[PDB]
């Protein structure tokens, strides 16, 4: 009665809130011929600080 | 001289339509479009392949 209902006791309730995303802590995979390396060789021949 | 229902267990039929969203290894999980509406019941698994 207190709040509009005819009998006294437990009444059902099913509420809902919305959902979309903001900051996605994304993550991915690394499949193991596309691997190329870049090596640089120097020679301690004549030089200057420059 | 006014009852009310409470629950309803079923014995069932409709187990006719099918779906199988495939995902290759390392390509992650598989999301079946039939997951937007209770139109169907989905469950994931994995298959040995290549």
d(CA B29, CA B44): 8
d(CA B29, CA B21): 9
Q: How many CB pairs under 8 A join A and B?
A: 3
Q: Determination method here?
A: cryo-EM
Chain A residues near residue B26 by CB distance under 8 angstroms: 29, 31
d(CA B18, CA B41): 10
d(CA B35, CA A7): 40
Chain A residues near residue B28 by CB distance under 8 angstroms: 29
Tell me the residue length of chain A.
Answer: 50
SS (H, E, C) B21-39: CCCCCCCCCCCCHHHCCCC
Contact by Cβ (8 Å): B35, B10: no
d(CA A5, CA A8): 7
B26 in contact with A at a CB cutoff of 8 Å? Answer: yes
């Amino acid at each position: 009665w207190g709040n509009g209902c005819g009998l006294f006791g437990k009444g059902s309730i099913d509420t809902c809130a919305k959902f979309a995303c903001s900051t996605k802590a994304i993550g991915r995979t690394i499949l193991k011929e596309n691997i190329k390396y870049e090596v640089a060789i120097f020679v301690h021949g004549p030089t200057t600080v420059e | 001289a006014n009852l009310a229902e409470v629950r309803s267990y079923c014995y069932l039929a409709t187990v006719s339509d099918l779906s199988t969203k495939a995902a290759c290894p390392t390509m992650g999980e598989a999301h079946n479009d039939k997951r937007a509406d209770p139109a169907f019941v989905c469950r994931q698994g994995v298959v040995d392949r290549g």
